[PDB]
Symmetry: C5
């Protein structure tokens, strides 16, 4: 009965995420955020090169 | 005693439905993902409008 | 309940919670709607901008 | 009796290690994220193709 | 039974949940789902940048 009522309780509820641990954010940074930084930098380089091709004498 | 073994069992058997995250998580997530996507999107708009229209993309 | 019960419960519950792993269900509608605004819609705009770029680059080779 | 107060404190004292998500989650996440990454990736590679092809010709 | 469901669910929804380092099982899935595609996108973008710069700097 306990295993069932607990599972029923766990699946009935909703879960609000707090701030993640320092360990999670370190993992997420390498998995996602650092890559986004590099993609932003690469893209801004490309934009600036294209703009400079339009503006250069 | 037995309360630890059956509880782990219940926890692993269950599935967990995320609610809206806390203001704290969302503010972290906005910095780690959403704000960067905005800058990337705005940069690609700039690229496109310069290449296509020879004008500056504006927000 | 006694303090000794309280301590056992806290230690047993925390140990069980950290021993287990958590399989995510379909998120609630509030989460998926938030995530769509936070992430998915921005990826769509990025994707659409690239499609316009590709279309124009390919076309100029007319 | 004293259960929900002690339970809340335990739930918030622990940290949570995510497992492989359910099939419903991954099916959802694929539509919400990964399918769009694939489309973005495909469009970038087409752009690389064109710029390379012009270089070779 | 009624009370247990009631107070346990009340507690679960009142608490907030701090993510640990995810399991290797989750990161393996998330790598396929996200991080590998981010890698590929970055590599293509970098190739595009380098070739547009290469043509600018050529001869």
């Amino acid at each position: 009965w306990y295993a069932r009522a607990t599972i029923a309780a766990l699946q009935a509820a909703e879960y609000r995420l707090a701030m993640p641990s320092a360990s999670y954010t370190a993992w997420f940074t390498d998995a996602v955020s650092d890559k986004l930084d590099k993609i932003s930098e690469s893209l801004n380089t490309l934009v600036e090169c294209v703009i400079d091709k339009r503006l250069a004498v």
